[PDB]
Amino acid sequence: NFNGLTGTGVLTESNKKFLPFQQFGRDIADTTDAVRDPQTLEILDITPC
């Protein structure tokens, strides 16, 4: 649960170049594939289990 966003998956460090205002990325199925950690501001990639 990241700031209200829920799901199941494996979290890894992201290499995605998020802009300073972006909080999460989206796939073609409108699923979340990356989030910004609300406390550390670290970008994490989400890979389903």
Ligand X SMILES: *[C@@H]1O[C@H](CO)[C@@H](O)[C@H](O)[C@H]1NC(C)=O
Burial group, residue 47, by CB count within 10 angstroms (0-12, 13-18, 19+) = exposed
Beta-carbon contacts of residue 48 (< 8 Å; ≥ 6 apart): 8, 9, 10
Binds 40, which of other proteins, ligand X, none (CB < 5 to 8 A, cut-off by type)? ligand X
For residues 8 to 27, the per-residue mask of contacts with ligand X, x marking binding by CB under 6 A and - elsewhere, is ---------x----------
Does position 9 bind other proteins by CB under 8 A?
A: no
The site for ligand X (CB under 6 A) is made up of 17, 39-40
The site for other proteins (CB under 8 A) is made up of 16-26, 34
